[PDB]
């Protein structure tokens, strides 16, 4: 029970896939830029590049502030690791002019070498949750984030964070859905987050991935989620 793919869409999408000048700038939003190159990553079973995710995570953030939806500040992709590797002092200034506590949910897209994965701070639920589409654990990620919160609190709000009651854990291999290919991480990761931000329970499996791939395309260029 998802939106149909109309004549209009197919014909638009199919067109953007057919190669022909990959530099062509074909969608500019959130100071981000989407090229035929960037957009190609959605075809068949390609590896989702960073641009597509950041953009999708921006729309996900925009579609927050919509009445009766958890308000979300989504993070940069290059955020997680720059913190993980260089520490807080590096990413410090990245959250000037945004109270990370003003929102219900923080969204953390994570890149680790070969892999796309997601971490979700949910202030309302008072717990941090890591999401591998291939059911791999990252207990540590949360620890790093909880540390971020600790630091951020002091650097912005000039008081310590209330650790009390907070849970941290990654999701089991069968708790959520699994990807049957090598390339659908960023696809799970993105749709994972979408589903969440709508307070919707996870619906989608591998089955719906080819469709979601198509659908994402449209959503990107037009800048509208379905």
């Amino acid at each position: 029970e998802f939106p149909e793919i109309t004549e209009e869409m197919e014909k638009e999408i199919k067109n953007v896939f057919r190669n022909g000048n990959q530099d062509e700038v074909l969608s500019e939003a959130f100071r981000l830029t989407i090229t035929r190159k960037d957009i190609q990553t959605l075809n068949h079973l390609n590896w989702l590049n960073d641009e597509i995710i950041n953009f999708y995570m921006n729309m996900l953030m925009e579609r927050s502030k919509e009445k009766g939806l958890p308000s979300v500040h989504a993070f940069n992709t290059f955020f997680f690791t720059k913190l993980k590797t260089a520490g807080y002092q590096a990413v410090k200034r990245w959250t000037k002019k945004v109270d990370v506590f003003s929102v219900d949910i923080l969204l953390v897209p994570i890149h680790l070498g070969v892999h796309w994965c997601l971490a979700v701070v949910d202030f309302r639920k008072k717990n941090i949750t890591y999401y591998d589409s291939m059911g791999g654990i990252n207990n540590e990620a949360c620890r790093i984030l909880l540390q971020y919160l600790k630091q951020e609190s002091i650097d912005k709000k000039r008081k310590e964070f209330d650790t009390n009651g907070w849970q941290l854990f990654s999701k089991k291999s069968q708790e959520i859905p699994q990807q049957m290919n090598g390339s659908d991480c960023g696809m799970f990761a993105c749709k994972y987050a979408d589903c969440i931000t709508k307070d919707r329970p996870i619906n989608f499996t591998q089955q719906h991935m080819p469709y979601f791939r198509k659908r994402m395309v449209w959503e990107i260029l037009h800048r509208k989620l379905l």
Partner: protein, 79 residues
């Protein structure tokens, strides 16, 4: 409308200093940073405080002061 200093740090941990007029686009620098200290271009990204930077963008119209630092990362791909 005088010059300001800008640090460009790779995620290999390498600051590369630069002088600049504060109103000129960052195309001049972004391509100089690729040429000197050789790097791809259509395979990296620039980000002043997690905010993306397009060639269009100028320093003044990004609110960078002196010795402000710019982050630059490899393009990222994954499953």
């Amino acid at each position: 409308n005088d010059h300001i200093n800008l640090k460009v740090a790779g995620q290999d941990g390498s600051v590369v200093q630069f002088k600049i007029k504060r109103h000129t686009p960052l195309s001049k620098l972004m391509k100089a940073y690729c040429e000197r200290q050789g790097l791809s271009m259509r395979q990296i990204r620039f980000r002043f405080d997690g905010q993306p930077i397009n060639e269009t963008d100028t320093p003044a119209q990004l609110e960078m002061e002196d010795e402000d630092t710019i982050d630059v990362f490899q393009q990222q791909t994954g499953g």
